[PDB]
Amino acid sequence: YEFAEKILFTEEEIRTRIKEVAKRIADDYKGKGLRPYVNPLVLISVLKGSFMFTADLCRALCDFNVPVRMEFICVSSYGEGLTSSGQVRMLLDTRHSIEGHHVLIVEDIVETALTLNYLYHMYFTRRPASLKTVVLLDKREGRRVPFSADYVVANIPNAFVIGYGLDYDDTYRELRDIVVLRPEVYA
């Protein structure tokens, strides 16, 4: 890992935290009557970064018998400096309607929260039975709009992280661990 200046979390540490978060989520919905087909917990995976976190999380939720429905969404920037609001173009939205369902947006990392805040509100306006967010990493001090994730795997400082779905110029997403991109590489 010559391109990394430090290891944040190993695959093992990540695996354990997700399991804890999943047990937590499971307990939290224990009284919502989740059932496959008719009342599953809808996971809205925001591409591309959360693809790895989502794969491991849904399996951990499966361990606690929480029936889920996987949705993947693809968003795009409108252009540079065209929005304050965090508005994004929807290239791929949910396949089914979330109206009346329990929904959980899955993200890899939240910092400014501009896009996640915009997405939260958009889905909120579609009337799901409930709406919450689970983010793997949270750069709490990087906010540009106020926003709180309901479930978070780890809070971290303002370092550029890569690995476990997280990229730098679309490189390193495949690492099993989360590491800090060393400055000399970004330079």
Ligand X SMILES: O=P(O)(O)OC[C@H]1O[C@H](OP(=O)(O)OP(=O)(O)O)[C@H](O)[C@@H]1O
In the complex with its own copies, the residue whose CB is nearer, 7 or 91, is: 91
- Phi, psi (deg, nearest 5) at residue 38: -90, -40
In Å, what is the CA distance from 14 to each residue of 130, 133, 163? 27, 18, 11
In the complex with ligand 7HP, the residue whose CB is nearer, 50 or 94, is: 50
Contact stretch for ligand 7HP (CB under 6 A) within 40-48, 59-67, 91-99, 158-166: 158-166
Residue 138 touching ligand X (CB under 6 A):
no
Q: How far apart are CA 42 and CA 30, in angstroms?
A: 15
Contact stretch for ligand X (CB under 6 A) within 8-16, 107-115, 125-133, 156-164: 107-115
In the complex with its own copies, the residue whose CB is nearer, 13 or 143, is: 13
Residue 186 touching Mg ion (CB under 5 A):
no
In the complex with ligand 7HP, the residue whose CB is nearer, 21 or 161, is: 161
Strands 68-76, 89-92: pairing kind: antiparallel
Long-range contacts of 15-18 (CB under 8 A, 24+ apart): 15/56, 17/153, 17/154, 18/53, 18/56, 18/57, 18/60, 18/153
Residue 111 touching ligand 7HP (CB under 6 A):
yes
Report 11-70 residues binding ligand 7HP (CB under 6 A): none
In the complex, minimum distance from the CB of residue 30 to ligand X, in angstroms, rounded to a whole number: 28
Gyration radius of the chain over CA positions: 17
